[PDB]
Design a protein around this nucleic acid. Structure first.
Ligand SMILES: [Mg+2]
Ligand SMILES: [Mg+2]
Ligand SMILES: [Mg+2]
Ligand SMILES: [Mg+2]
Ligand SMILES: [Mg+2]
Ligand SMILES: [Mg+2]
Ligand SMILES: [Mg+2]
Ligand SMILES: [Mg+2]
Ligand SMILES: [Mg+2]
Ligand SMILES: [Mg+2]
Ligand SMILES: [Mg+2]
Ligand SMILES: [Mg+2]
Ligand SMILES: [Mg+2]
Ligand SMILES: [Mg+2]
Ligand SMILES: [Mg+2]
Ligand SMILES: [Mg+2]
Ligand SMILES: [Mg+2]
Ligand SMILES: [Mg+2]
Ligand SMILES: [Mg+2]
Ligand SMILES: [Mg+2]
Lengths: 106, 53, 258, 103, 220, 62
RNA sequence: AAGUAACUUAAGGAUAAGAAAUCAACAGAGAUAUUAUGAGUAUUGGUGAGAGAAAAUAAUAAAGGUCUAAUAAGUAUUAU
RNA sequence: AAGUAAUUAAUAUUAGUAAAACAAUAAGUUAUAAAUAAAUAGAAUAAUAUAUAUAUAUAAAAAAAUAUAUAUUU
RNA sequence: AUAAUAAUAAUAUGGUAAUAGAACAUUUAAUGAUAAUAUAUAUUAGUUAUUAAUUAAUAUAUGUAUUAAUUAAAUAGAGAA
C-alpha cells in the first residue's frame, strides 16, 4: 500500500486533533519484532539494575500512575520518568511484571 | 476551508486545518489569531523576535 | 476491571494541502503520516543531525608549520656552555620569534563524524514535522493524485517556471517577473526560501538566480536537515515528499499480536 | 541469430572467431603445422621434434569451457579429454576417491 | 526564528574535557596532574612495566596450543525455536525442513555463520514442534526432545564453500549460473561422525554411496 | 592499532570476565617433596585484581 | 632502527606489475595495481623489545586479453 | 611561548534500535552458553540446587570451581 | 512526586601532590533584529556579592556588530623556562 493514501481512504477519526489523544491518554508501541518495549539495564559498573519502558507516546505520568496501581508491590519512590525521551525507569528488575501488565492492553 | 481562506485573504495553517473540526472552531481561531494583528499593525509577529511583548 | 483505563489508539494521519506553484492555490488535501509531519519536537535529535552535517561539511585547511617543516638549518645557534646566555638549539624552536608552532596540525585535517542512519532519519522527520507545525511547509504537486479543484491555466502542478528561455523580447523576460510577483504577493522578500524538487528545474533555477542570497534550490537526493531548518519557507513537490517519507521510514516486519 | 550469439561473453566469442566450429580439432597431440591442431593440447613441432605449450593455457581453457557449459555450447569447442581436467558433474561422477579416504 | 539557534544536546550526553596547564585556580596548574618530578613527569613509561621484577607475562608458563583445525559452531537452543513458533515468526510450509538456510532467513541464527550451527537443548521441556530439523550436529538431549515431540533430526556435513552455497544459492546462480555441488567428506573425523547413528549422521541415516565405496575398498 | 602482547597471550587465556594461568614451580626439582603437597602446584589459577588492569591493557582484543 | 637517511647510476610522462610451472582443497576460482573486512587471527621472536600474512567477500578500473617464440640446458634440481 | 593529532582497546553518561545492534551489494564485528590445552562434549527424568553442563575421576555417583533453569525467552 | 525564589532547625565549608563539579574573558563557524537619539575603543565617577558586565560625562572612528542567546571548535587566559 502507498505511504500516502487517497483522501477517501482516511476516516475523520484517524486524523490528529480528533479523538482527544493529547489529553490524559497514552500508548506503547511494540518492537519491530512484535515484543513489549520493556528492558533490563545494568549501570554504574553492573551494580545498578533498572527496568526501562520505552516507545511511549501520550501521558507518561498517567501511564506511570496506572502501572503503579497495577504493580503496588513496587515502592512509589522507585519510579522515575525521563521526559526528553519519555521513558519510565524503575529501580530493580521488574521486566516480567511490567510485561504482564502491559500485554493486557498493548 | 478553501472558500474561507479565499474570501478572507489569509492562509490558515494546514496543521490547524487538520486539527480544528467545526466552523465555530475556525471562527474562534481566526478571531483570536489574525484579527488582533490586523487591527493593530504594531501587535504583529516578528520572525526575528519570536518571544516579543 | 480495566488494568490500563486511559490507554488509547493514537492518530496516524495528517492533512497537507497540495497546491500549484506560481500561485499557491489549494487543489486537494492529501493525508500524510504523523511519523512524517506531526512528530514531536526533538531538539536533541536535531542537534545531533546538524552537528554531524556541519562536521562533515568542513574543509580542514589549517596548516601551521611545526619545528620540522619550518625552513631553518638543523644547527646549534650558540655553544652550550660559555656563551653566558640561555641554552639554545636550532632556530625552529617554538619558543622563538621565527620558530615553529608546537603541536601543529597538518592539512587536510579530518573532522568527519558518523551518526546512525535511524537517528538521521528520525532527525529528518523531526525537521519536516517542525516546518509543518510552524505552517511553513508548502506542498506543490499533482497529475498523480485526484484533484477536487482544477488547476489554473496560468499555473503549473510542478515546482518550475516555464517560458523562461524565450528571451526574444526585451532586456527582461517572463520568468523573473513572475517570480518577483510571487515574492511580493506572498510577502516574503528577504526571507530564507528552500525549494525541494524531484528533477532539475532549470527554469526555477534561472528565475531565482537573482535572489541567490536568500533562495536555495535542491533536489530530493541532496537536501539536508540544515537546509530544512534554515529555510523560513520550505516548498516541496509531492513526489519529493513521498520519496523522503519512504526513505526515512521506520521499518516493520510481521508484528502480529492480540 | 545475432541477439543470441552476441549475448555470449568476450572470451567465448573471441575463441569462436579464432577457432571456428567448422574445423574438427584432433583429440590427441599432433603436429604444430596441422590444420586441425587442438589449441588445448601441447602439439609437437615436426622439424625439431619438441612439444609446444598449448595456445590456450589451463586457466584460459577452463574459463572458456566453463562459459561454454554455462551457455550450452559444448560440441562447438575442441575436445578436452586428453587435458587431465574434468568439470562439475562429470568430475564428481568419475572421481576416484583418495587412497587415504578409502583405506 | 530558526531552530538552529536554539538546538541543544540531551542532558548527560556532553561533558567538559579537563584542561591542563592553564592556571593555578583551575586545579590543574603548573604540574598539570603529572606530580613532582620523576620519569612520568616529563617522560613516557609503559603502563605494564614493573621496575625489573619478572613480569606477569614471564613468570608463568606457556600453556596450551591453538587448534587451527577448529570448527566453531553457532549455538541454537530449542527454546528459541519454540519462542519463534509461539510468536508466529517460524514460517514453515507444511512438509518443509528447518535447515541453516531457513534459520538465517527467519532470523533464528543471526550474524555470520562461519562453519555451522549446533542445536542444543535448553527449552527441551517445553518443545513440542513436530517439524524436521537440519544442522551440523545436535546434543543428545536435543535429539531426544526433537524425536519425542514427533519431529526429525539429521546432521549434515558442509564445507565453507558448501555452506555458502547452502545459505545464499542465488548469489552463485546470478554470478556463475550454477550452485556448486556439495563436497563429500574427506577427513576421517567427518566420516566417522556422520557414520555414527547416535549422532544422527546423514551418511548412515540415508545410506549414501560413500560408505558403500569405502566398504568396497576395504573388502578388496 | 594496538597489537596483542604474544607472551601474555601464550601464558594467559580468557575465561569468563577474567583470565586464567598456569602455576609456576613444577618443572624440575620435584623429587624429595611430598606429592600431596605438590598437588597444589598442578592446574590453573585465575588472574588477580592487582594485575587485571595490566592484563586488560596487554590483551586489548581478548 | 632499516634496506630507512645518504651517495651513485639509468628511463618515461609516468615508471613498476600483469594474463599462472597462481591459489586452493576433492567443492572451486581464474591477469595486474590500490582500498575495507578477514585480522593484529594463522605465523614468528636473546619465544625478549617486538614483527605479522594469505584464501574469501566487496569498492575503484579498462574492450582487458594477446603472440611476437622453429616453446627455451650449464637451465630445473643437488651440496655449500 | 607549552597535554595537541591520527590508528586502536577498556570504562562511564545520554540518544537511536533492542533479543538484537551497525551495515545494508556480499561480507563482516559485538551479543545470543558456560567450560577445556584440545577433541566427534554442552545446562530441570512432573523443579532451586539436594537437579543440570564443563573440567579432574568414571560402572555411575560423591568431592573442588564456575555457570543455567522458580504471562514471559537475556 | 518537578523548577525558581524565599523562610525555619541541624550539620559542613584551611589546604601542597591529587580527584571531582561549575562558570567567565578571547577568536572562529551555523541561526540572528536593531542603528549616528546607535555601535566600538579609551579615561574618570557610580551600580550589581564584581577574573565580568553595566550607567553617566568626555575623546576618536564608523550609517556601523559574525551582536543577545543556544550550539560546534580552538594557535582560548603568562611575573616566572
Ligand atoms: Mg562533534
Ligand atoms: Mg592542586
Ligand atoms: Mg623526588
Ligand atoms: Mg619542576
Ligand atoms: Mg611521579
Ligand atoms: Mg635482575
Ligand atoms: Mg609439565
Ligand atoms: Mg600442605
Ligand atoms: Mg610498462
Ligand atoms: Mg618491517
Ligand atoms: Mg616455455
Ligand atoms: Mg616448456
Ligand atoms: Mg641452495
Ligand atoms: Mg558429572
Ligand atoms: Mg576547601
Ligand atoms: Mg574551617
Ligand atoms: Mg597560547
Ligand atoms: Mg606579556
Ligand atoms: Mg598573574
Ligand atoms: Mg620570562
Amino acid at each position: 500500500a502507498p505511504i500516502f493514501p487517497k483522501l477517501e481512504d482516511v476516516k475523520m477519526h484517524e486524523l490528529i486533533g480528533n479523538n482527544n489523544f493529547g489529553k490524559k491518554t497514552y500508548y506503547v508501541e511494540r518492537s519491530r519484532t512484535g515484543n513489549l518495549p520493556v528492558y533490563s539495564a545494568y549501570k554504574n559498573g553492573g551494580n545498578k539494575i533498572i527496568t526501562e519502558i520505552r516507545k511511549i507516546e501520550g501521558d507518561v505520568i498517567q501511564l506511570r500512575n496506572d502501572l503503579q496501581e497495577q504493580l503496588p508491590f513496587i515502592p512509589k519512590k522507585s519510579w522515575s520518568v525521563v521526559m526528553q525521551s519519555k521513558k519510565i525507569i524503575i529501580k530493580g528488575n521488574a521486566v516480567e511484571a511490567v510485561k504482564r501488565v502491559l500485554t493486557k492492553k498493548f | 476551508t478553501k472558500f474561507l481562506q479565499s474570501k478572507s485573504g489569509y492562509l490558515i495553517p494546514d496543521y490547524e486545518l487538520t486539527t480544528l473540526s467545526t466552523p465555530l472552531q475556525f471562527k474562534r481561531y481566526i478571531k483570536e489569531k489574525i484579527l488582533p494583528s490586523a487591527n493593530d499593525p504594531k501587535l504583529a509577529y516578528k520572525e526575528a523576535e519570536p518571544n516579543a511583548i | 476491571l480495566n488494568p490500563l483505563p486511559n490507554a488509547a489508539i493514537p492518530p496516524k494521519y495528517a492533512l497537507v494541502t497540495v497546491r500549484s506553484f506560481p500561485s499557491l492555490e489549494p487543489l486537494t488535501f492529501v493525508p500524510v503520516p504523523t511519523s512524517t509531519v506531526a512528530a514531536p519536537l526533538r531538539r536533541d535529535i536535531l542537534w545531533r543531525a546538524v552537528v554531524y552535517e556541519n562536521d562533515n561539511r568542513r574543509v580542514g585547511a589549517s596548516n601551521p608549520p611545526g619545528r620540522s617543516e619550518n625552513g631553518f638549518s638543523r644547527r646549534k645557534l650558540m655553544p652550550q656552555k660559555g656563551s653566558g646566555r640561555a641554552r639554545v638549539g636550532d632556530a625552529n624552536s617554538p619558543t622563538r620569534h621565527n620558530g615553529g608552532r608546537a603541536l601543529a596540525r597538518t592539512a587536510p585535517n579530518d573532522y568527519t563524524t558518523e551518526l546512525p542512519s535511524k537517528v538521521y532519519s528520525m532527525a529528518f522527520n523531526n525537521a519536516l514535522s517542525h516546518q509543518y507545525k510552524s505552517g511553513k511547509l508548502f506542498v506543490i504537486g499533482g497529475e498523480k493524485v485526484d484533484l477536487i479543484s482544477p488547476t489554473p491555466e496560468l499555473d503549473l502542478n510542478r515546482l518550475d517556471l516555464v517560458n523562461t528561455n524565450t528571451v526574444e523580447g526585451k532586456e527582461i523576460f517572463e520568468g523573473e517577473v513572475i517570480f518577483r510577483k510571487f515574492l511580493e504577493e506572498f510577502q516574503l522578500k528577504g526571507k530564507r526560501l528552500l525549494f525541494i524538487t524531484d528533477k532539475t528545474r532549470e527554469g526555477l533555477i534561472k528565475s531565482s538566480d537573482p535572489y541567490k542570497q536568500k533562495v536555495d534550490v535542491i533536489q530530493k537526493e541532496l537536501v539536508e536537515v540544515n537546509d530544512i531548518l534554515r529555510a523560513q519557507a520550505v516548498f516541496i513537490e509531492l513526489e519529493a515528499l513521498e520519496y523522503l517519507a519512504m526513505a526515512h521510514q521506520k521499518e516493520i516486519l510481521h508484528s502480529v499480536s492480540n | 541469430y545475432k541477439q543470441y550469439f552476441d549475448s555470449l561473453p568476450l572470451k567465448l566469442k573471441s575463441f569462436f572467431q579464432r577457432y571456428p566450429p567448422s574445423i574438427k580439432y584432433s583429440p590427441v597431440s599432433t603436429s604444430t603445422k596441422a590444420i586441425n591442431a587442438n589449441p588445448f593440447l601441447p602439439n609437437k613441432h615436426p622439424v625439431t621434434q619438441r612439444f609446444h605449450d598449448p595456445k590456450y593455457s589451463l586457466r584460459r581453457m577452463s574459463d572458456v569451457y566453463k562459459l561454454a557449459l554455462r551457455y550450452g555450447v559444448e560440441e562447438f569447442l575442441p575436445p578436452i579429454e586428453n587435458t587431465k581436467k574434468l568439470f562439475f558433474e562429470e568430475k564428481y561422477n568419475k572421481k576416484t576417491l583418495m587412497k587415504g579416504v578409502l583405506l | 526564528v530558526s531552530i538552529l539557534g536554539q538546538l541543544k544536546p540531551s542532558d548527560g550526553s556532553t561533558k567538559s574535557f579537563k584542561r591542563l596547564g592553564r592556571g593555578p585556580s583551575s586545579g590543574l596548574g603548573k604540574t598539570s596532574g603529572r606530580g613532582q618530578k620523576g620519569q612520568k613527569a616529563r617522560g613516557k613509561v609503559k603502563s605494564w612495566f614493573e621496575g625489573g621484577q619478572t613480569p606477569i607475562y614471564k613468570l608463568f608458563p606457556k600453556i596450551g596450543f591453538t587448534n587451527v583445525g577448529a570448527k566453531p559452531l553457532k549455538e541454537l537452543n530449542l527454546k528459541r525455536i519454540q519462542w519463534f513458533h509461539d510468536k508466529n515468526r517460524l514460517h514453515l510450509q507444511p512438509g518443509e525442513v528447518l535447515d541453516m538456510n531457513k534459520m538465517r532467513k527467519l532470523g533464528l541464527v543471526t550474524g555470520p555463520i562461519k562453519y555451522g550451527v549446533k542445536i542444543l537443548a535448553s527449552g527441551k521441556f517445553h518443545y513440542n514442534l513436530p517439524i524436521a530439523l537440519e544442522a551440523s550436529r545436535a546434543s543428545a538431549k536435543a535429539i531426544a526432545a526433537i524425536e519425542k515431540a514427533g519431529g526429525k533430526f539429521t546432521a549434515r556435513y558442509y564445507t565453507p564453500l558448501g555452506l555458502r552455497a547452502h545459505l545464499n544459492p542465488q548469489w552463485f546462480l546470478e554470478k556463475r549460473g550454477r550452485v556448486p555441488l556439495q563436497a563429500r567428506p574427506t577427513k576421517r573425523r567427518d566420516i566417522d561422525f556422520y557414520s555414527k547413528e547416535e549422532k544422527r549422521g546423514y551418511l548412515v541415516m540415508e545410506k549414501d554411496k560413500l560408505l558403500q565405496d569405502i566398504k568396497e575398498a576395504q573388502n578388496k | 592499532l594496538m597489537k596483542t602482547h604474544k607472551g601474555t597471550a601464550k601464558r594467559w587465556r580468557r575465561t569468563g570476565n577474567t583470565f586464567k594461568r598456569g602455576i609456576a614451580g613444577r618443572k624440575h626439582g620435584n623429587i624429595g617433596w611430598s606429592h600431596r603437597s605438590l598437588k597444589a602446584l598442578t592446574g590453573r589459577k585465575i588472574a588477580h585484581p592487582a594485575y587485571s588492569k595490566h592484563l586488560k591493557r596487554l590483551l586489548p582484543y581478548h
